[PDB]
Structures are given as C-alpha cells and as structure tokens.
Amino acid sequence: MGGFGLKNPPPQILIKNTPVPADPPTQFSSQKINSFITQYSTGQMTVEIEWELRKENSKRWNPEIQYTANFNNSANAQFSVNNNGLYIEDRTIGTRYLTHTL
Amino acid sequence: MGGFGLKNPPPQILIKNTPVPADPPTQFSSQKINSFITQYSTGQMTVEIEWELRKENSKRWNPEIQYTANFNNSANAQFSVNNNGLYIEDRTIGTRYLTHTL
Amino acid sequence: MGGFGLKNPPPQILIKNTPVPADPPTQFSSQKINSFITQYSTGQMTVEIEWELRKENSKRWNPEIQYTANFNNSANAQFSVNNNGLYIEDRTIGTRYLTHTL
Secondary structure, rough: OOOOOOOOOOOOOOOOOOEOOOOOOOOOOOOOOOOOOOOOOOOOOOOOOOOOOOOOOOOOOOOOOOOOOOOOOOOOOOOEOOOOEEOOHHHHHHHOOOOOOO | OOOOOOOOOOOOOOOOOOOOOOOOOOOOOOOOOOOOOOOOOOOOOOOOOOOOOOOOOOOOOOOOOOOOOOOOOHHHHOOOOOOOEEEEEOOOOOOOOOOOOO | OOOOOOOOOOOOOOOOOOOOOOOOOOOOOOOOOOEEEOOOOOOOOOOOOOOOOOOOOOOOOOOOOOOOOOOOOOOOOOOEEEEOOOOEOOOOOOOOOOOOOO
C-alpha cells in the first residue's frame, strides 16, 4: 500500500478506563463483580515527528509541473469547511511532481 | 514600468574599437585621417548578482495557486527550442501567486 | 550486456568549440547572429585507470585451457595491420579460461 517498512515500528499505545465497582452486597459472595459504575474519559494528545528530507538540485532549463489549487470559482473553497461546518478533502495528492533523470 | 528606483544605479559600461588608420601619404597633410582599417571585436562577458529575498511564513490551512507548466501535450516543449533551433518564451510570468493578509 | 553496475559512474565529459561570429553589420539589429566563422579543433587525450585484480591459487594437478594464438600460418598476423594499413581484430576474447571449483 506504500509506506516505510520497519523492523521496529512505532510502539502501539493502549489505554483503558480502570473499572470501578458498584456497591457490593453485605454477605460475602465469591463470584465475579458483575456491575460497575458507568464512566468514560477524555483528554488531549500530541504527536511531534522529526522528518528528514532531500534537497532538490536539478539543472533542467524549463519549468516543471507543480501542485496548484483548482482555477475555478467554487461554492466552497478547497480543503475547507462548508456552510454546515464539515471539513472536506477535495482530492488526493501524491508526492510525485518534480522530475529526475532516469 | 515596475522595477527598483535607484538614486545611484549600476554604472553604464561603454566600449569601442580603437581606430587603426590605413597607410598615410608620404607628403604631409593636416586634414583628419579619413580611411581606417575595417575591424570588429568579440569576446565573452559575465554578470554575477547577489539577490536578497524574504522568507514566507503563512499559516493558511488550504493550498495556494502556484505557477505550473501547461497540462497539454504540445508539439514543442515550453520554454524550449523548436525544430529550427529557435528559443521561445511561451508566456509572461509575474511574481504574484502566494497570498498575504491585507 | 555485462559490466560493472555503478551508482556513481565516471562523469561524462563534454566539449564544444566556442562560437566566433562573422563581421556584424554597422546598423544595429536585435536578431540572433546567424553566421559564424567555420572552425574545428583537435588535440590529444589520455586515460589512466588503476585496476585491482585477484590472485589465482589452485591446486589442480593437470594443466588448464588458456588463450593462445592460432596455429596456422596466415597471410596477415593476428591482431595486426594488413597491407593497406587497416587494423583488424580477428576474434572476440572472453575472460573465462582458468577453472574454479563450484
């Protein structure tokens, strides 16, 4: 599917809500606790990645194809929300534009 | 016409072929020398200019218009010679594509 | 086709005769200079390559096939000029003669 094959990829990150039981009975019972307190959690996360990239030195005279926004006036600007507030990717973008000698 | 107005622009550069006279007469004559040796000169020149330029920091989410080569298959590649060997600029290019807040 | 595949092969070497124009007209004209002075150049070149090579240690008793000149008396000696002065390679020579265990 494309990507970077890794022998030792980034570690999976796993999270759970610690179970909190409801009020137990007064007489002891050895069965598992069936009923818990309904709860959920929320928060924020962050991801910071350092990318390495290769400079482009090419002596071709004439100009090259590059990625540009569409030239039509549209009802909704590209890669932007609509009236209802929904974000929309208008099309996929590949990374291959600049050329290189074979 | 657009450009950089300068109080002290780059100096003009002026060049001439030094005149070489033809064979003078043996008897002295005080008039100007009318006839010279026909000659011309040629060589190479170079111009090296150091340009300063302003970085672009803009936080707009969506992509921008950029200059790209035309998308049609053409008989002659753009900004390139033809069969006869003549270099051709296909169109003018202005410098204003990226946007900026007013 | 056989050879040594290289990521960074020996650099191409490119050479040109610098164009020298013919006598220009006296009235200025902005068109390209059509006519030049016909000329060509010549000289000598040299190439010095350092080759690394592998010694042969083999304990096989009996003798091996080796490349030898043909045994017939011929009108023209092999790998040599003819009467008219033309150099002639009589046949191709591969590098595989000595044997090695598999």
